């Protein structure tokens, strides 16, 4: 599975973006 | 006063009991450097409970770190309060236990007893009464299973008239580490059985699924994993240094929960567990608690409860909340949970007002509960221990160091022996 | 406060008001450039409303307090002339901090501040106290209608007290 | 206590549910992170110590309009998984979402009207927002309507659907949609108010006199007519009226539910300066066939039932002469077994606006809902369009390759013209 960057809309983009910024 | 006495065990016991005692210390309000900083006499009033004086004011854990290999202890010194414990409170191995119960139990910890009794009779005749002891250690390894599992046999009969809680880490249906898997998980269990208090049932395959829906985060590290349980390890012996209403304490615990000798394995869970995007959107009361603790997805413990039936159930709330709140909601769960609940026991449950809340949180709950669900997690250690001795298969090693096939075969024969009441209970 | 110092409004006949002498009256920022043909066709429609909309009561209804963004003083003074209403000096930086307080710049945004959208010249913009925008007449916008947007005007809710 | 919850449905759910929720904390009052600076209960629900959580679910296949509130400005207001989105579109089919995507959504919201319900006794209804013209908004509008027909048996349902109009539809595939959607939204469903597309357009031209709106004043006046319908509601006032004594004035016959509406005044800047608006003319101009939402001339139509809440300061006297004004009226038109036919609702406190949109604020304004014979044209000239492209099966292969059958089309044409033959013998 393709994981990308937090500042994109796929998964659970809310909070790859609040615990764990990148 | 009232003191526990707290081992690490393995690599798993030593790692899940620093960030116990870096949850316990900041609940009492304690810098990791020993001084008290939080000014509340109630949160330090009961201190001695599981610390000790240093004569300048510092606060040393009753805490006993053991393990065979140096390499997961020195991580702990250099991690975060790590200055904590007492450096004599440590004692090293420099050998390694290779994934086996044989060197663990009998051969290479035999040379380790001498001082790990020297230093547990240490702490526990310093005080006036000691209450209990509380281990932590993983039946998947050799230095936590073999090893740990050395401890219960020569602590009981030294301490008989005594309790202790042990919080043994289970290994996994779907992933496996440590290859050898059912013959370190067999070996522990059927002393287990004989000669401990009681069990509470940690599973790390299934706390990666709570921490995978209710807590849903993509990367679990080990850190979050044994913070999650830190915080049921905290919650059922949170009365014995806090009061409240209606207390509870491990002795208490036991008699009231083991109805016959040889069932002694617990359900464990916290909640809430709520996750980071319903943080500020739960007005936090006793229905959703009690919906989310009797409730089977959110179990530490890798066993379904739908199949099973909650011989006796046990919830040790805390906070600022409502006593009959507490009451006839639990007898709602009943009517509506009626054939979850045996039918020869009216009224299954504990209530335990612990006045004092979680860290930071208002209010909350910690459930622990006998179960019959867990038939089915004995019992698929039970055919992995028969799939693999079949076949003679990861034997030699063991046998080289004083093992028999005689006693693999009790080993077995305690196992199914163990599972046996637990079907003709439902 | 005070969103124009005692030197700041500038009126017809060369003379200075601060920001006091417009209380209980309509205030509205005229952004606008001499050489846009946006600005040359809506000058004309502006110098109608304002004059016949005033002319048409008992009290003075609105103001206008120009700002440029014209390229040199003899091209601030050419446009100026053609009109009577508020106005304010281009070599005040008061002007530039209003520009960007306003967003109504003139696309030179990365060399100097580099933040987003500019919606530039023209637009006029009533004002409330305390230098808060109180609504966007819609000339160039989502709506981007001209010459005709000053219908628009609230001109009882959107007082300068 | 007595609460009352929300459901949006396809992409026109979601964001004239925007409107409607930022309408709704802009009249209480509460800063939309939460924190106000007890009438606000029905419609928001108390989350900790000051915060106020909506009571509605956004629901809709695609993630670019859920993911565009969520990334939004009230990403702090609504619960980010009170929002449900889906990963496929239904592609303008009522057969993607009634039988293949919609199994893996509905078994979600089902739990989350289930968590929003379970929590207080007293629940007055459900307010289904949603499009006849969306695939999503009808494919899983309709099995959302139904499987909430079978649970919740004896609660009332407020609709309120995007119909197609006769000059735009916006979708080459929309008449097969809507046949198809009000065949089963017949049965489900308690009430459902009918909103056309540019009759509310020429409402935007002609008494709000802006020439080229967007779906900002579409959303608008839709968001200004469910404030002054639930008025009552939350806020207290001289007659109060609630949902379930709507369909006990509105709804004679259990076959006969769907029905127009009105706002007035609809007015800017220029038209509070200039005119008065009296209780005896806005009346008339909520009567007018300019400002009727769904651009069906009554005076071929018959009203049958009235329900005219007035939000605002007005008293019992003046609008009671309001009524017999209207009945006086001679081109205006009563079936002869209904002679009371208006049946007023009142409340005190003032009408919003919006800051920033093209109304001007009134305090003393009207809705009006109308049961009328009228509707049967509406709904016929929508079965022979239909009729048309059903002629050598226009569009039919993406349905039947779906999983539906070649009948469901049919079975839709007796139900519809049921309807037809509904409306002309109780407009005798
Ligand atoms: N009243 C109103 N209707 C709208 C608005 N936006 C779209 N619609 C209606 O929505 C209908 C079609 O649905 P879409 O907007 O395309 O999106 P959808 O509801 O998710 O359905 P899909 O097309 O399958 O994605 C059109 O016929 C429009 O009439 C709006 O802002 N206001
Ligand atoms: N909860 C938790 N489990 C662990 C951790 N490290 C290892 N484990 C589990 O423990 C098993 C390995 O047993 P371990 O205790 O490391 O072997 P030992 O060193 O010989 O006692 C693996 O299957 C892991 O799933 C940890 O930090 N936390
Ligand atoms: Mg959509």
């Known amino acids: 599975m393709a994981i990308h960057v937090s500042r994109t809309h796929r998964e659970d983009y809310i909070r ?7 | 006063m009232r003191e526990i006495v707290h081992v690490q065990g393995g690599q798993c016991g030593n790692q899940i009991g620093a960030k116990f005692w870096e949850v316990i210390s900041d609940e009492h309000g304690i810098d990791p450097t020993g001084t008290y900083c939080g000014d509340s006499d109630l949160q330090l009033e009961r201190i001695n409970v599981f610390y000790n004086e240093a004569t300048g004011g510092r606060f040393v854990p009753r805490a006993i770190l053991m393990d065979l290999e140096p390499g997961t202890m020195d991580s702990v010194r250099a991690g975060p309060f790590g200055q904590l414990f007492r450096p004599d409170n440590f004692v090293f191995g420099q050998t390694g ?5 044989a060197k663990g139990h009998y051969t290479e910890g035999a040379e380790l007893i001498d001082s790990v009794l020297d230093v547990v009779r240490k702490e526990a005749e310093g005080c006036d009464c000691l209450q209990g002891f509380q281990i932590t250690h993983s039946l998947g390894g050799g230095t936590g299973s073999g090893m740990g599992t050395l401890l219960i046999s020569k602590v009981r009969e030294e301490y008989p008239d005594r309790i202790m809680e042990t919080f043994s880490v289970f290994p996994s249906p779907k992933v496996s580490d440590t290859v050898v898997e059912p013959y370190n998980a067999t070996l522990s269990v059927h002393q287990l059985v ?5 069990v509470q049932v940690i599973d790390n395959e299934a706390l990666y699924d709570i921490c995978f829906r209710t807590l849903k985060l993509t990367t679990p590290t080990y850190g979050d994993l044994n913070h999650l349980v830190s915080a049921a390890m905290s919650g059922v012996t949170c009365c014995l240094r806090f009061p409240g209403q209606l207390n509870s304490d491990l002795r208490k615990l036991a008699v009231n929960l083991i109805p016959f000798p040889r069932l002694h394995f617990f359900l464990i869970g916290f909640a809430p567990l709520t996750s980071r995007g319903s943080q500020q959107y739960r007005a936090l009361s006793v229905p959703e608690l009690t919906q989310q603790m009797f409730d089977a997805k959110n179990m530490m413990c890798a066993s379904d409860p739908r199949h099973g039936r909650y011989l006796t159930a046990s919830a040790m709330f805390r906070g600022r909340m409502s006593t009959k709140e507490v009451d006839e909601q639990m007898l709602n769960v009943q009517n509506k949970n009626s054939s979850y609940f045996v039918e020869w026991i009216p009224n299954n449950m504990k209530s335990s007002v612990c006045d004092i809340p979680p860290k930071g949180l208002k209010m909350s709950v910690t459930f622990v509960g006998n179960s019959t669900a867990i038939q089915e997690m004995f019992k698929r250690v039970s055919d992995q221990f028969t799939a693999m001795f079949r076949r003679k298969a990861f034997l030699h090693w063991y046998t080289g160091e004083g093992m028999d096939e005689m006693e693999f075969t009790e080993a077995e024969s305690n196992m199914n022996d163990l599972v046996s009441e637990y079907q003709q209970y439902q | 406060l005070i969103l124009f110092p005692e030197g700041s409004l ?13 209380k ?7 952004f606008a450039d001499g050489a846009d043909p946006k600005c040359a066709s809506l000058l004309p429609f502006l110098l109608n409303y304002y004059r016949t909309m005033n002319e048409g009561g008992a009290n003075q209804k609105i103001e206008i307090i120009f700002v440029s963004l014209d390229r040199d003083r003899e091209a601030f003074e050419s446009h100026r002339a053609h009109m009577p209403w508020l106005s304010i000096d281009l070599e005040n930086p008061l002007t530039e901090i209003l520009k960007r307080h306003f967003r109504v710049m003139k696309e030179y945004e990365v060399p100097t501040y580099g933040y987003g959208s500019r919606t530039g010249v023209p637009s006029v913009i009533v004002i409330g106290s305390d230098g808060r925008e109180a609504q966007f007449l819609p000339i160039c916008s989502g709506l981007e209608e001209g010459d005709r947007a000053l219908l628009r005007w609230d001109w009882r809710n959107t007082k300068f007290a | 206590m007595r609460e009352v919850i929300s459901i949006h449905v396809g992409q026109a759910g979601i964001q004239i549910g925007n409107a409607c929720w930022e309408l709704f904390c802009l009249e209480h009052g509460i800063q939309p992170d939460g924190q106000m600076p007890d009438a606000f209960n029905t419609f928001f629900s108390e989350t900790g110590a000051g915060k106020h959580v909506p009571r509605c679910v956004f629901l809709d296949l695609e993630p670019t309009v859920v993911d565009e509130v969520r990334t939004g400005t009230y990403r702090h207001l609504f619960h980010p998984e009170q929002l449900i989105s889906g990963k496929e579109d239904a592609a303008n089919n009522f057969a993607r979402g009634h039988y293949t995507i919609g199994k893996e959504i509905v078994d979600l919201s089902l739990d989350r009207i289930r968590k929003l319900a379970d929590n207080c006794t007293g629940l007055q209804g459900f307010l289904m927002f949603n499009a006849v013209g969306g695939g999503t908004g009808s494919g899983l509008g309709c099995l959302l309507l139904e499987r909430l027909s079978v649970d919740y048996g004896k609660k009332s349902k407020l609709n309120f659907c995007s119909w197609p109009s006769p000059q735009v539809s916006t979708a080459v595939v929309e008449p097969y949609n809507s046949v198809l959607s009000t065949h089963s939204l017949l049965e489900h469903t308690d009430v459902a108010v009918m909103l056309d597309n540019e009759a509310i357009y020429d409402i935007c031209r002609r008494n709000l006199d802006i020439e080229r709106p967007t779906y900002t004043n579409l959303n608008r006046l839709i968001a200004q007519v469910i404030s002054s319908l639930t008025a009552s509601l939350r806020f207290d006032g001289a007659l109060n009226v609630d949902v379930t004594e709507f369909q006990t004035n509105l709804v004679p016959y259990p076959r006969i539910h769907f029905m127009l509406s009105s706002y007035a005044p609809i007015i800017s800047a220029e038209k509070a300066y200039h005119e008065q608006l009296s209780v005896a003319e806005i009346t008339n101009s909520a009567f007018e066939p300019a400002s009727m939402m769904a651009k069906c001339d009554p005076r071929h139509g018959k009203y049958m039932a009235c329900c005219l809440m007035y939000r605002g300061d007005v008293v019992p006297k003046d609008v009671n002469a309001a009524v017999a004004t209207i009945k006086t009226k001679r081109t205006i038109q009563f079936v002869d077994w209904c002679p009371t036919g208006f049946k007023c609702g009142i409340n005190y406190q003032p009408p919003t606006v919006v800051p920033g949109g093209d109304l001007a604020k009134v305090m003393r304004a009207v809705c009006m809902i109308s049961n009328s014979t009228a509707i049967a044209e509406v709904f016929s000239r929508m079965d022979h369009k239909f009729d048309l492209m059903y002629a050598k099966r226009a569009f039919v292969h993406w349905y039947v390759g779906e999983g539906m059958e070649e009948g469901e089309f049919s079975e ?13 013998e109780v407009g005798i």
């Not at chain 3, 209980?24 to 005229?30: C, F």
């Open chain 2, 97 to 101: 236990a290779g994934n086996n119960w």
């Open chain 3, 24 to 30: 209980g009256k309509s205030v509205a920022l005229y």
């Open chain 3, 10 to 22: 500038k009126n017809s006949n060369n003379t200075v008001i601060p920001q006091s002498h417009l």
């Open chain 1, 16 to 22: 790859s973006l609040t615990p764990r910024p990148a």
């Open chain 2, 194 to 198: 004989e000669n401990a208090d009681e």
């Open chain 4, 412 to 424: 839709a044409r007796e139900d519809l013209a049921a309807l037809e033959k509904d409306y002309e």
